Structures are given as structure tokens and as C-alpha cells.
Amino acid sequence: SGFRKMAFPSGKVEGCMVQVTCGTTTLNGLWLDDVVYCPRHVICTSEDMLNPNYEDLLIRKSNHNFLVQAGNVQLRVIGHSMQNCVLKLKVDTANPKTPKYKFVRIQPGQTFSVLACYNGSPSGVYQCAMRPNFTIKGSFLNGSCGSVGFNIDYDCVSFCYMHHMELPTGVHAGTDLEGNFYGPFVDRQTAQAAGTDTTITVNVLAWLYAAVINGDRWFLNRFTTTLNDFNLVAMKYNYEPLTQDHVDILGPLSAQTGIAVLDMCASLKELLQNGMNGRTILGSALLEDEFTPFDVVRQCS
């Protein structure tokens, strides 16, 4: 029993983190095989920020300008190249701790674990979701750029996020490991801001199922709704539309609890319209949307 924000064990990723320094800027890199990946803004200077031409900035670099350190061991850079908004620094040594891995871009509403790192040293690990507006509500301080987000399937690390920036509202943005930003954010100085966000409906329903599995039942009712009528309510409360695919994805949890999805939808509608009247669900006084159906199954059997 119990239900927590649970991250994947981080050991396989810890062994991949290195420190990358260019000029006076130090941040984190990801060392896999004989390549270190890091944000390309490591080559920026304070004066470059309005409209850096990264192609020019990189042509002006040499391998010796990148200092890469894996703990107390310096790695020799033997090649450098840009891939979208990341840099690929080829090093003379393959990382002996390289896990089986994949680079995998995630969808809004998916979750992942973040290993926050400073000066190439892991500091902590927490669970995050990719918001509908392609930001993440992370916890990151100066020096954390190049920290990565990941999931683990069996022995294989699926890297899905590399950290690049903090937006004015305190939320975060970054890229996939191919260097392509999530959302309409750019690695240059602008007034960019997180766009309007919505609540991830399928995840709220998954979390309601988690609650039922853990003995919280007060919000259940005898009613069922139609998908159409539920989506009318969803729109009014800034929730994402619920699709039949979502209903299908929730099938296993519906079967385990004996509560049909559209029955749970009627409970959600009442919670949106009436609130919780001073009660809590899984220790929360608000509807939590950062657990996916898979996250719930993983933790609730």
C-alpha cells in the first residue's frame, strides 16, 4: 500500500554524468560510449545572447577549448559537432559504465525521472511530467543545465530530456537528446514565456484509481456519464479532452477495481463542480495529474 512520487533508481545514469567547461561556463554532460552530449549554449558568452549564430560560435572553437571531466579523470576531446541545440563532443575513451540506452522523445502528459546534477555530480532525483504546454515543473538551480530526464525499461535507459533553461515563471524547458526543444522555446534571449497550460485528464483518472486501490473511496458514486457529457465539463475546467484511447488505456485499472472508466468520470465531474469539501485523496487536497496509468500500475500492482 501507499502511493508516492516515485522515481527510477538513478545509478545507471549517475555513471554517465560528467562536467563540461567552455570558457567561464561550466555545466553537465552525458557521457555515453565515446560521446559527451551537452547543451550548445555552453559556447555562448554574455555578449552573444541577443542573436547568437551558433554555427559561427562553434566554427571558432577547437577541441582543446572544451574541458571534460569524469570525476577526477579528464577526458580528451577529439572532435566536436552540433546536433540541433546540443553539442556532441567526441572523446578518446568510451564510458565503461555506459548502460543499454535509447534516445526517445516523450509526449505531453508522460512522466520521467530527473537526475539533477551540478558540476557533473548528481545531487538528487525526482519525478516530473511533461506539461501540455511543453514545460516541466522541475527543481533546478544555477549550474544544472545538462541534467537529464529518463525512464528505465528492464535494463535499458530511455533518455527523454536534457535541461536547458528556466522560464520567467520558474518552470523549465529543454530538449530531447537529439537536441530538439520541447515546445516553442529557443536558446537565445527573448521574452519567451510558458503558454497557457491544461490539466492532464487521463492522469487524474489514473490517480483516482490509485486512490481506490489504496482505500480512498469517498468520491465514488453510483452514476455514470457519457464521454461527450464528460468532455463538456472537462473543457469548462481547463482539462484536456478524454479520448476512447484513454478509456482503453485505463482498462486494466478499471478491471482491477471493478469501476468502469465512465463511472470514474462521473466522480471526477462531481469533484470539479463541488470540490472536496475538506477531504483529501491520497494525501492531497487537489486533483493530481502527474501520474500516468503506467505509473499507477507500476506502484499499485
Which residues belong to the active site?
Answer: 41, 145
Nearer to ligand LQL, 165 or 281 (CB): 165
Quote the least distance from Cβ 24 to ligand LQL, whole Å. Answer: 12
Nearer to ligand LQL, 95 or 113 (CB): 113
Quote the least distance from Cβ 180 to ligand LQL, whole Å. Answer: 14
Nearer to ligand LQL, 5 or 188 (CB): 188
Nearer to ligand LQL, 37 or 230 (CB): 37
Amino acid at 71: G
Quote the least distance from Cβ 218 to ligand LQL, whole Å. Answer: 39
Other beta carbons within 10 Å of 133: 18
Number of residues that bind ligand LQL (CB under 6 A): 15
Tell whether residue 128 is a contact of ligand LQL (CB under 6 A).
no
Distance from C-alpha of 215 to C-alpha of 106, rounded to nearest angstrom: 32
Q: Cell numbers of 163, please?
A: 535541461
Distance from C-alpha of 74 to C-alpha of 67, rounded to nearest angstrom: 8
List binders of ligand LQL among 215-274 (CB under 6 A).
none
Instruction: Report DSSP letters for 221-282, one per residue.
Output: -S----HHHHHHHHHHTTBPPPPHHHHHHTHHHHHHHT--HHHHHHHHHHHHHH--TT--BT
Output the residue with the shortest Cβ distance to ligand LQL. 165
What is the number of alpha carbons within 13 Å of residue 44 lying toward its C-beta? 20
Distance from C-alpha of 129 to C-alpha of 40, rounded to nearest angstrom: 24
Q: Cell numbers of 245, please?
A: 484511447
Quote the least distance from Cβ 173 to ligand LQL, whole Å. Answer: 8
First-to-final CA distance of the chain: 10
List binders of ligand LQL among 144-203 (CB under 6 A).
144-145, 164-166, 187-189
Give just the sign of the alpha carbon dihedral 189, 163, 86, 44. Answer: positive
Nearer to ligand LQL, 46 or 274 (CB): 46
Q: Cell numbers of 237, please?
A: 475546467
Tell whether residue 137 is a contact of ligand LQL (CB under 6 A).
no
**Which residues of the chain form beta strands (DSSP E)?**
17-22, 25-32, 35-39, 66-70, 73-75, 77-83, 86-91, 101-103, 111-118, 121-129, 148-153, 156-166, 172-175
List binders of ligand LQL among 36-65 (CB under 6 A).
41, 44, 49
Quote the least distance from Cβ 139 to ligand LQL, whole Å. Answer: 9
Amino acid at 109: G
Nearer to ligand LQL, 19 or 199 (CB): 19
Quote the least distance from Cβ 165 to ligand LQL, whole Å. Answer: 3
Q: After what residues is the chain interrupted, C–N > 2.5 A?
A: none
Find the part of the chain contacting ligand LQL (CB under 6 A) among 143-151, 223-231, 244-252, 259-267: 143-151
Tell whether residue 140 is a contact of ligand LQL (CB under 6 A).
yes
Query: From the list 62, 142, 228, 274, which residue makes contact with ligand LQL (rule: CB under 6 A)?
Result: 142
Binding site for ligand LQL (CB under 6 A): 41, 44, 49, 140-145, 164-166, 187-189
